Amino acid sequence: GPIPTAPRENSLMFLSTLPDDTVPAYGNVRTPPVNYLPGEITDLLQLARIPTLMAFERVPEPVPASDTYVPYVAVPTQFDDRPLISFPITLSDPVYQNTLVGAISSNFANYRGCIQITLTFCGPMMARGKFLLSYSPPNGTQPQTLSEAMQCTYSIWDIGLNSSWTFVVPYISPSDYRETRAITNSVYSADGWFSLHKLTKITLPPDCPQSPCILFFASAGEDYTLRLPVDCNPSYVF
């Protein structure tokens, strides 16, 4: 006998994100297997953990063309009590725009966990110096003073045999998740600032080249997590 059925009001609706299969039209097809091919990607956070280059403007004020964005910050000999480079911890900011962490995360609504900033000193081996790397919680005014950076979460990095320092930005958030994109620039989307201060000047023996450069990488920590995939930005194709 015919089974009595009550079709719901949402019948014949196509739903793009429906978690169910549809009818097969061309079954009994065996594809070539894939034993030989290595490098299988189970999860996109495996590529988020890979460090990639950030971007900054090269030098103020005159530049031949504004497109001259550069993956390093040059260290001048001149001393003034302001950071050499600073950027907000906000994953929609241009400093993350061409990193894998920013590009992957920008297609997700929320993130959780730590961002890992990696620095690389590309100057000569004879160079000696010290840098203070400081992460500031959100505040009414961004800190600029080295004394103000010293009051925040900070680590001192020494130039020596090992050329690199991995700075893990701590996850300090009022909510369990944070917004990837700062629409209203609220506390849930902008998590303060990271800043670089020189502690001592870089010292050089004579005939060394002046102004060495620190190469910047951005990467996801091992606790980093992404949630709620959203529509992409198609701006890259135009």
Partner: protein, 35 residues
């Protein structure tokens, strides 16, 4: 698993709902190693 929730019952056989490859004869792996 994938984006699938209706796990209780499958109407069509696996070799009709999906392809399968022919025979020839979490915790994340690192993509690079150092020797």
């Amino acid at each position: 698993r994938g984006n699938n929730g209706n796990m209780t019952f499958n109407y069509y056989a696996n070799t009709y709902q999906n392809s399968v490859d022919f025979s020839t004869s979490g915790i994340l792996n690192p993509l690079g190693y150092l020797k």
